[PDB]
Structure 1
Amino acid sequence: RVEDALHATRAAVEEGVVAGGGVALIRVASKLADLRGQNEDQNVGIKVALRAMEAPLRQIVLNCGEEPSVVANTVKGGDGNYGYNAATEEYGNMIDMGILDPTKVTRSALQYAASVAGLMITTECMVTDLP
Structure 2
Amino acid sequence: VAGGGVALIRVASKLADLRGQNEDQNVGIKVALRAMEAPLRQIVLNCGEEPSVVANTVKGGDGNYGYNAATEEYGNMIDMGILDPTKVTRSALQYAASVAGLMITTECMVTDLPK
TM-score normalized by the length of structure 1 = 0.85
Q: Which runs of 4+ in 1 moved over 3 A?
A: none
After superposition, the C-alpha distances for 1:31-50 in whole angstroms (9 at most, x for unaligned) are 11111011100000000001
Q: 1:74 is paired with a residue of what secondary structure?
A: helix
After superposition, the C-alpha distances for 1:59-96 in whole angstroms (9 at most, x for unaligned) are 10001110000000000011111111111111111111
Please say if 1:129 is aligned against 2:103. Answer: no
In 1, Cα distance between the equivalents of 2:103 and 2:13? 26
In 2, Cα distance between the equivalents of 1:92 and 1:66? 16
Q: 1:95 is paired with a residue of what secondary structure?
A: helix
- Stretches of structure 2 that go unaligned for 5 or more consecutive residues are none
Shift of 1:113: 0.3
- Identity rate, percent: 100
In 1, Cα distance between the equivalents of 2:40 and 2:102? 25
User: Larger RCO: Structure 1 or Structure 2 (Cα < 8 Å, ≥ 6 residues apart)?
Assistant: 1
In 1, Cα distance between the equivalents of 2:9 and 2:62? 11
TM-score normalized by the length of structure 2 = 0.96
Provide the aligned length of Structure 1 versus Structure 2.
114
Residue 29 of structure 2 corresponds to which residue in structure 1?
A: 46
- Stretches of structure 1 that go unaligned for 5 or more consecutive residues are 1-17
